[PDB]
Design a protein around this ligand. Structure first.
Ligand SMILES: CCCCC/C=C\C/C=C\C/C=C\C/C=C\CCCC(=O)OC(CO)CO
Length: 135
């Protein structure tokens, strides 16, 4: 029973964010700033209802969803694309498919210990992020 992802989470590692951004066609000036940043993620979860805020000194990104309910997602201030997003549970892993112009786009997020893991995929690029829970 580890579906409860509530909390404030501070990034401790960010593997291949460069490759994931390049797969999304982010220009190199934007990548040069974005690759260096520590992100914070705030998850406010009530059952299958999620309100999430991911923040940094450069850009912030909010996304709210209900697990199992497809929604329109506009990745404002990121790659600025429109996708149809669906989040589901696979066991206790939160899985998102972002259907749109990029193949194999989505993410998976899950808890282990006091760490949150987030793997973001676009095409043949996977970015692996780890966050530690803030007290
Ligand atoms: C929002 C902080 C980082 C922003 C970096 C700025 C520009 C880079 C442009 C594009 C890269 C694409 C995505 C950023 C990667 C992660 C932020 C969270 C994305 C997301 O949907 O996470 C889900 C799962 O945690 C939010 O519910």
């Amino acid at each position: 029973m580890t579906r409860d992802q509530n909390g404030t989470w501070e990034m401790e590692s960010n593997e291949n964010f460069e490759g994931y951004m390049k797969a999304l066609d982010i220009d190199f000036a934007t990548r040069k700033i974005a690759v260096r940043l520590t992100q914070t993620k705030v998850i406010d979860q009530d059952g299958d209802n999620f309100k999430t805020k991911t923040t940094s000194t450069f850009r912030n990104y909010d996304v709210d969803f209900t697990v199992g309910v497809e929604f329109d997602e506009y990745t404002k201030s990121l790659d600025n694309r429109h996708v149809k997003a669906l989040v589901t549970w696979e066991g206790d892993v939160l899985v998102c498919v972002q259907k749109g112009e990029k193949e194999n786009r989505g993410w998976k997020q899950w808890i282990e210990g006091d760490k949150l893991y987030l793997e973001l995929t676009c095409g043949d690029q996977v970015c692996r992020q780890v966050f530690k829970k803030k007290l």
